[PDB]
Amino acid sequence: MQDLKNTKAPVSTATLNRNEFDSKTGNIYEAISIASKRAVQINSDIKKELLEKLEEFATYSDSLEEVFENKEQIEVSKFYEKLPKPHALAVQEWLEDKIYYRNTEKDA
Amino acid sequence: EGLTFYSSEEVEIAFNERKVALNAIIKVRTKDFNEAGELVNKIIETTVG
Amino acid sequence: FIIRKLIERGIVKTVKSAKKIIDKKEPVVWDILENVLKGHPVLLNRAPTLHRLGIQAFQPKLIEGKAIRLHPLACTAFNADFDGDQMAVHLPLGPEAI
Amino acid sequence: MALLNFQKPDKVIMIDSTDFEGKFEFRPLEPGYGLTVGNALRRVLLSSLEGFAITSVRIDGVEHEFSVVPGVVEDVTEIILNLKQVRFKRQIDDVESETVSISVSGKEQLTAGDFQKFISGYQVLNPDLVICNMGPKVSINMEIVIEKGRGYVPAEENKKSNAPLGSIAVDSVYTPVKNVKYSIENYRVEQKTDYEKLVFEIITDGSIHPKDALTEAAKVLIHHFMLFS
Amino acid sequence: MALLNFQKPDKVIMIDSTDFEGKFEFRPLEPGYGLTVGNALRRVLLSSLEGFAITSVRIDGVEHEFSVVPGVVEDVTEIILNLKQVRFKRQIDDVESETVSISVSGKEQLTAGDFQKFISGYQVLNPDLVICNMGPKVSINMEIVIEKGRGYVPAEENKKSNAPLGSIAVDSVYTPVKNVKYSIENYRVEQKTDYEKLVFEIITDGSIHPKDALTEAAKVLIHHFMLFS
Amino acid sequence: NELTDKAGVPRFGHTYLYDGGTGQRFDQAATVGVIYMLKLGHMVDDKMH
Ligand SMILES: [Mg+2]
Structure with a gap:
C-alpha cells in the first residue's frame, strides 16, 4: 500500500510540465488515460482503507437524532480529507515511473 | 543617477533606502549573454526599474 | 461531494440530513468545501465560444459575494x-475529466 | 474585556529560517491590519538598522577608480565592487573606525578572509568573498577604512576632505537587511473569508538573524507608539 | 543596546482639543518614522474603535419597514435612516446594552433629544437631529435597542430570532471617528534639521475624546506588535 | 476654473492623493472630484444561479 502520509503529490491544482508528463509515452493523451485508470485504482484502494478505518472507529448509537458527533471518526475523516486527491497521486506516480502500463492490442 | 552596483541586491537596497530613483540610469553587474551565447558577468547600463 | 464528506465524518447518516446541513450553511460545510475545492478544477465558459480558449480550467477558491472572480490574463x-459580462461554470465529475 | 469581538493572532509562526533569510507568518488578522503591520515593520526594518562597511580604499600604483593594477584580472572598478560586498561584524565594543593596511602575496586569489588576519576590531562575515584574481608573482597592498553608519550611503557623502591622496571613496551598504518583502493572503475563519494572513520575508547579511531584526523592529514600533499613552 | 543614537520623543503634546476635535503633536522623530506612526494610527483610528448605536426599532402599529405611521410626514424608512444617525456617549459604566421605550405626543417634531428623557445609560450627542415631522395630535410609541459594536454591522446580522413581532432591525454604524488628518513637518534639534514633527487632527462624534481615541489606537498597535517578541 | 478657484479646488481637479494602506503620496497628481453615478437594474442578486 502507498504511504499516504509521506506522499509528494501536490494538494491542490498545480502547473505541471507537459513535456515531462508525456516523455515516457510520447503522447499526452495516452499518459492522461493511463493516469486516470491508475487514479481509479488509487481511489478504490483509498476508499477501502478509509472504510476499514471508519468501521474500526464506528460507534453504535441507537439515538434517533439526525446529527451525530464522533470526534475520533471526525479526526480520521479529516486526516483522509487533507490528503491529495486520487488523480494527483496518480500523476505523482506517473512522474516517478511507478505505473506499469501495457497495450494489449499492440502486443497481440 | 550614474551609480555603479555589484548586483541587483545593492540596487534593491538603494531603492528601498530611497537613495536612487526608480527611473534613474544606473550601472549594475549581472549575468548576460556574450557574443558567443554564454552566460558571463558584465557591467551594463540600465534602469533601477 | 460535501454530502460524501458529511457521511464519512459521521455527522449525518443519510443524504437528507446532509442536504439539511448544507442548506443551513453551517461552518462545517465551509470547512469541508475548502478541502473539496482543492484539486478539483472547474471549467469557465463565456458565450460565444469562438475558439477552444473560450473554455478554460481554473482551480476554484471560496470568496465572499455573488460574483465570480476571474484572473485578468484570461480576459x-x-x-x-x-x-x-457573465460566464458559465461547468464542473467535471470523473477522474478522467478532472 | 471589551476586546472580545476583535480577532487577533496568537503567535508569529516561523516557517523557514537560515542565517541569511527568514519566513514568518501572522494569522489571523482583522481586515486591513495586515497592510498596516507589514508596512510599518518594513519601513522600520529598512530605515533604522545600523552597521559597518568599507568607506575608503587605497591601492599602490592607482590614482583613480578608472585604471588598471598590474597583474590582476579584475580592474579597480571591479575591485571596489567586490569590496562593497565585504560584511563586517564588530568584535570589540566601542570600536567605531579602523584603518587596516594589508599586504598579501604568493596567492592566485585574494579573499575577504585574508583581511581578517590584519583587522583587529571587526570580523569578516564572508571570508570566501573573492576580491581580486592575480598571478602568483603579484603583491598587492591595500588600506581600507571601516566605519559605522546607517542605511545606504553613496561615495559623495562618504567623501572626506582630509583623506590621503590616492584614496577612493566607496559606496557603503551599512544596513544589515538586504530586502524586506511581505504579502497578504485571505485567511478563512469559520464562515468569514475576509480575514487576513501576513507573511514576512527578510534577507540579512549574516550580522543579525532575521528573527532578531523583526524583534528589533517590533520593539522600536512599540517604543514609538507607547508615547501616546 | 544599539538604540543609543535614535532620538525618540518624550511625550505627545495636545495643542487644542474639544470633545469633538483635537490637535496633537509628536516630536522629535527620526526621518521616515512620522509617516509610519501617522498611517498606523490613522488606520487603527478609522477601523477598530468601539462605539454605540441602535440595533432594533419597533414602532407601534407598524409591522414592516415599508409601511407608514398615520399623521407622520416621513415614512418608516426615512425614520429608520434618521435613527441610524443618532449618536450616543456612555454615561454609566459597564452598560453594554439598554432597551429604551419612547412615547412622544403633542409635538410637531420628534428630535433625538426627546429620547433623552427615556435613556438612562447613554447620552445623545446630537439632540437637534430630527427623526420625523408629525402632526400635533400624533402619538408616537417606539422602542429602540442600543448596543456596543465596532465598525459597521448590517441589519441582516442584527436580526434576532427571539425578537418580538414588529421589530425592525437597522444598519449600525458604530465608528466614533469621523476624520483623521496627519501632517509631517521638519524639526530642528540642535544642529540637525532632518528630524520630523508629526501633527494629528482628529474629528470624533463626541462619544470618545480625541486623546482617548489616540490612546486606544496606540493600545491596539502595542497589542499587535507585542506578538513579535 | 473660476468656480474651482473660488471653491479652493486645484484646477482640473489635479491634486496629490495619499494611499490609505501605506500613506505614501502617489508619484503623480490625480483627477479628483464629484461624479453623478447611477445604479442599474442588472444587479447580481438576479443573475447568480
Ligand atoms: Mg462586456
Missing part, C-alpha cells in the same frame, strides 16, 4: 470585460 482569451 483576452475569453474576450471578457467587467462591464456586466
Whole structure:
C-alpha cells in the first residue's frame, strides 16, 4: 500500500510540465488515460482503507437524532480529507515511473 | 543617477533606502549573454526599474 | 461531494440530513468545501465560444459575494470585460475529466 | 474585556529560517491590519538598522577608480565592487573606525578572509568573498577604512576632505537587511473569508538573524507608539 | 543596546482639543518614522474603535419597514435612516446594552433629544437631529435597542430570532471617528534639521475624546506588535 | 476654473492623493472630484444561479 502520509503529490491544482508528463509515452493523451485508470485504482484502494478505518472507529448509537458527533471518526475523516486527491497521486506516480502500463492490442 | 552596483541586491537596497530613483540610469553587474551565447558577468547600463 | 464528506465524518447518516446541513450553511460545510475545492478544477465558459480558449480550467477558491472572480490574463482569451459580462461554470465529475 | 469581538493572532509562526533569510507568518488578522503591520515593520526594518562597511580604499600604483593594477584580472572598478560586498561584524565594543593596511602575496586569489588576519576590531562575515584574481608573482597592498553608519550611503557623502591622496571613496551598504518583502493572503475563519494572513520575508547579511531584526523592529514600533499613552 | 543614537520623543503634546476635535503633536522623530506612526494610527483610528448605536426599532402599529405611521410626514424608512444617525456617549459604566421605550405626543417634531428623557445609560450627542415631522395630535410609541459594536454591522446580522413581532432591525454604524488628518513637518534639534514633527487632527462624534481615541489606537498597535517578541 | 478657484479646488481637479494602506503620496497628481453615478437594474442578486 502507498504511504499516504509521506506522499509528494501536490494538494491542490498545480502547473505541471507537459513535456515531462508525456516523455515516457510520447503522447499526452495516452499518459492522461493511463493516469486516470491508475487514479481509479488509487481511489478504490483509498476508499477501502478509509472504510476499514471508519468501521474500526464506528460507534453504535441507537439515538434517533439526525446529527451525530464522533470526534475520533471526525479526526480520521479529516486526516483522509487533507490528503491529495486520487488523480494527483496518480500523476505523482506517473512522474516517478511507478505505473506499469501495457497495450494489449499492440502486443497481440 | 550614474551609480555603479555589484548586483541587483545593492540596487534593491538603494531603492528601498530611497537613495536612487526608480527611473534613474544606473550601472549594475549581472549575468548576460556574450557574443558567443554564454552566460558571463558584465557591467551594463540600465534602469533601477 | 460535501454530502460524501458529511457521511464519512459521521455527522449525518443519510443524504437528507446532509442536504439539511448544507442548506443551513453551517461552518462545517465551509470547512469541508475548502478541502473539496482543492484539486478539483472547474471549467469557465463565456458565450460565444469562438475558439477552444473560450473554455478554460481554473482551480476554484471560496470568496465572499455573488460574483465570480476571474484572473485578468484570461480576459483576452475569453474576450471578457467587467462591464456586466457573465460566464458559465461547468464542473467535471470523473477522474478522467478532472 | 471589551476586546472580545476583535480577532487577533496568537503567535508569529516561523516557517523557514537560515542565517541569511527568514519566513514568518501572522494569522489571523482583522481586515486591513495586515497592510498596516507589514508596512510599518518594513519601513522600520529598512530605515533604522545600523552597521559597518568599507568607506575608503587605497591601492599602490592607482590614482583613480578608472585604471588598471598590474597583474590582476579584475580592474579597480571591479575591485571596489567586490569590496562593497565585504560584511563586517564588530568584535570589540566601542570600536567605531579602523584603518587596516594589508599586504598579501604568493596567492592566485585574494579573499575577504585574508583581511581578517590584519583587522583587529571587526570580523569578516564572508571570508570566501573573492576580491581580486592575480598571478602568483603579484603583491598587492591595500588600506581600507571601516566605519559605522546607517542605511545606504553613496561615495559623495562618504567623501572626506582630509583623506590621503590616492584614496577612493566607496559606496557603503551599512544596513544589515538586504530586502524586506511581505504579502497578504485571505485567511478563512469559520464562515468569514475576509480575514487576513501576513507573511514576512527578510534577507540579512549574516550580522543579525532575521528573527532578531523583526524583534528589533517590533520593539522600536512599540517604543514609538507607547508615547501616546 | 544599539538604540543609543535614535532620538525618540518624550511625550505627545495636545495643542487644542474639544470633545469633538483635537490637535496633537509628536516630536522629535527620526526621518521616515512620522509617516509610519501617522498611517498606523490613522488606520487603527478609522477601523477598530468601539462605539454605540441602535440595533432594533419597533414602532407601534407598524409591522414592516415599508409601511407608514398615520399623521407622520416621513415614512418608516426615512425614520429608520434618521435613527441610524443618532449618536450616543456612555454615561454609566459597564452598560453594554439598554432597551429604551419612547412615547412622544403633542409635538410637531420628534428630535433625538426627546429620547433623552427615556435613556438612562447613554447620552445623545446630537439632540437637534430630527427623526420625523408629525402632526400635533400624533402619538408616537417606539422602542429602540442600543448596543456596543465596532465598525459597521448590517441589519441582516442584527436580526434576532427571539425578537418580538414588529421589530425592525437597522444598519449600525458604530465608528466614533469621523476624520483623521496627519501632517509631517521638519524639526530642528540642535544642529540637525532632518528630524520630523508629526501633527494629528482628529474629528470624533463626541462619544470618545480625541486623546482617548489616540490612546486606544496606540493600545491596539502595542497589542499587535507585542506578538513579535 | 473660476468656480474651482473660488471653491479652493486645484484646477482640473489635479491634486496629490495619499494611499490609505501605506500613506505614501502617489508619484503623480490625480483627477479628483464629484461624479453623478447611477445604479442599474442588472444587479447580481438576479443573475447568480
Ligand atoms: Mg462586456
